[PDB]
Design an enzyme around this catalytic site. Structure first.
Site, PDB file in Angstrom:
ATOM      1  N   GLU A 156       0.927  -1.206  -0.137  1.00  0.00           N
ATOM      2  CA  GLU A 156       0.092  -0.100   0.363  1.00  0.00           C
ATOM      3  C   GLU A 156       1.282   1.435   0.184  1.00  0.00           C
ATOM      4  O   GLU A 156       0.872   2.296  -0.453  1.00  0.00           O
ATOM      5  CB  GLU A 156      -1.145   0.027   1.342  1.00  0.00           C
ATOM      6  CG  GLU A 156      -1.905   0.843   1.115  1.00  0.00           C
ATOM      7  CD  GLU A 156      -1.229   2.553   1.670  1.00  0.00           C
ATOM      8  OE1 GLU A 156      -1.076   2.056   2.854  1.00  0.00           O
ATOM      9  OE2 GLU A 156      -1.824   4.103   1.720  1.00  0.00           O
ATOM     10  N   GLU A 157       2.165   1.167   0.866  1.00  0.00           N
ATOM     11  CA  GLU A 157       2.998   2.611   1.275  1.00  0.00           C
ATOM     12  C   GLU A 157       4.100   2.788  -0.445  1.00  0.00           C
ATOM     13  O   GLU A 157       4.179   2.124  -1.296  1.00  0.00           O
ATOM     14  CB  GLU A 157       3.494   1.906   2.753  1.00  0.00           C
ATOM     15  CG  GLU A 157       2.628   2.099   3.441  1.00  0.00           C
ATOM     16  CD  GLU A 157       2.005   3.865   4.018  1.00  0.00           C
ATOM     17  OE1 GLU A 157       2.692   4.579   3.340  1.00  0.00           O
ATOM     18  OE2 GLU A 157       2.136   3.632   5.544  1.00  0.00           O
ATOM     19  N   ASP A 211      -8.323   0.898   8.037  1.00  0.00           N
ATOM     20  CA  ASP A 211      -7.483   1.517   7.137  1.00  0.00           C
ATOM     21  C   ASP A 211      -7.294   2.747   8.617  1.00  0.00           C
ATOM     22  O   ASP A 211      -8.493   3.469   8.802  1.00  0.00           O
ATOM     23  CB  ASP A 211      -6.735   2.474   6.175  1.00  0.00           C
ATOM     24  CG  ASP A 211      -5.190   2.905   5.644  1.00  0.00           C
ATOM     25  OD1 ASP A 211      -4.708   2.183   6.979  1.00  0.00           O
ATOM     26  OD2 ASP A 211      -5.161   2.529   4.783  1.00  0.00           O
TER      27      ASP A 211
END
Length: 326
Positions: A156-157, A211
């Site tokens: 994701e990052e 999240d």
């Protein structure tokens, strides 16, 4: 337009049961969470160990588990990624999808745990599967064409400055993979009557993306009008849990107000984006504002707020129970 599935309100008995957290419940969740409270940098040994723990945990519960692995170019060179997709009943046409990311940011300042981002969400998904297993296994026998699917996204990052090309590696990959994988209702079990199924992504009935969870007093809003009917169930469940006195508050005569009965004008990039662009309905369970610890070295275990986590777990258990009629 009406939601394609009639949403049957949770019976009081089931609301109360789902809103219970015993000492055994807290202990089980915390034991699960401990496995995630380590750095989870893409390609690292600890990241692999976390993936193996997710996979084993769900295989042990008799879920179908796929490890969606691939290599992708990044500003730091070629990197390996592996999404984890666990499906309770693979053959069921439609999926309620709950998701989060299991990688942690490679932080410029030093070791970064990403306790809210997203160790807690990861643990919450596994906790749901564990705590509801009996009921989920019963639901799977019904032939009702609906199942639960958990997606743990990798990558994701961003490795450097967040961009279209540097972020969302796992989710971009999976969304494209499923979009290009053609299927039809005739190949699947018990699709809803007016369903338009052309590919695997069409089987994601709604994606509920968790999240940045675990800090005190998060504020959620409905980010998508499309999923307002689903979002409003979270609002309602939270209200009912408060009315029944099942939320943990520091003083008598208070209420949680996590799920605001409003929408907000805020654009957040996250793992839902590649799915949203392919017409998957999204409920984005992310706070606005982000936790104060966001992307700091203080996003760690001690800055978690356990009563909040407990309250969220009750809401999420009740929500899954309501949606799947457990």
């Amino acid at each position: 337009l009406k939601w394609p599935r009639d949403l049957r309100p949770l019976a009081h008995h089931d609301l109360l049961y789902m809103g219970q957290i015993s000492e055994e419940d807290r202990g089980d969740f915390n034991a699960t969470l401990r496995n995630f409270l380590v750095p989870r940098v893409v390609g690292s040994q600890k990241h692999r160990e976390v993936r193996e723990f997710i996979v084993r945990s769900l295989k042990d519960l008799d879920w179908d588990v796929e490890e969606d692995c691939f290599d992708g170019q990044t500003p730091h060179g070629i990197k390996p990624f592996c999404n984890v997709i666990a499906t309770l009943n693979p053959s069921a046409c439609h999926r309620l999808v709950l998701a989060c990311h299991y990688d942690s940011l490679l932080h410029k300042e030093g070791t970064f745990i990403g306790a809210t981002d997203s160790a807690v969400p990861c643990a919450q998904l596994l906790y749901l599967a564990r705590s509801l297993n009996g009921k989920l296994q019963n639901q799977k026998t019904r032939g009702d064409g609906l199942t639960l699917q958990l997606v743990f996204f990798d990558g994701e990052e961003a490795f450097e400055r967040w961009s279209s090309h540097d972020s969302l590696y796992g989710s971009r990959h999976l969304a494209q993979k499923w979009h290009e994988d053609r299927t039809s209702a005739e190949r699947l079990e018990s699709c809803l009557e007016r369903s338009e199924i052309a590919n695997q992504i069409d089987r994601m009935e709604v994606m509920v993306l968790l999240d940045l969870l675990g800090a005190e007093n998060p504020r959620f809003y409905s980010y998508f009008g499309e999923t307002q009917p689903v979002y409003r169930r979270l609002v309602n469940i939270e209200s009912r849990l408060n009315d029944a006195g099942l939320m943990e508050l520091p003083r008598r005569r208070r209420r949680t107000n996590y799920f605001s009965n409003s929408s907000t004008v805020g654009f957040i990039e996250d793992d839902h984006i590649p799915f949203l662009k392919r017409s998957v309905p999204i409920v984005h369970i992310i706070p606005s504002p982000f936790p104060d610890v966001w992307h700091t070295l203080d996003d760690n275990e001690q800055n978690l707020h356990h009563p909040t986590i407990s309250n969220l777990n009750k809401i999420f258990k009740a929500f899954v129970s309501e949606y799947l009629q457990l």
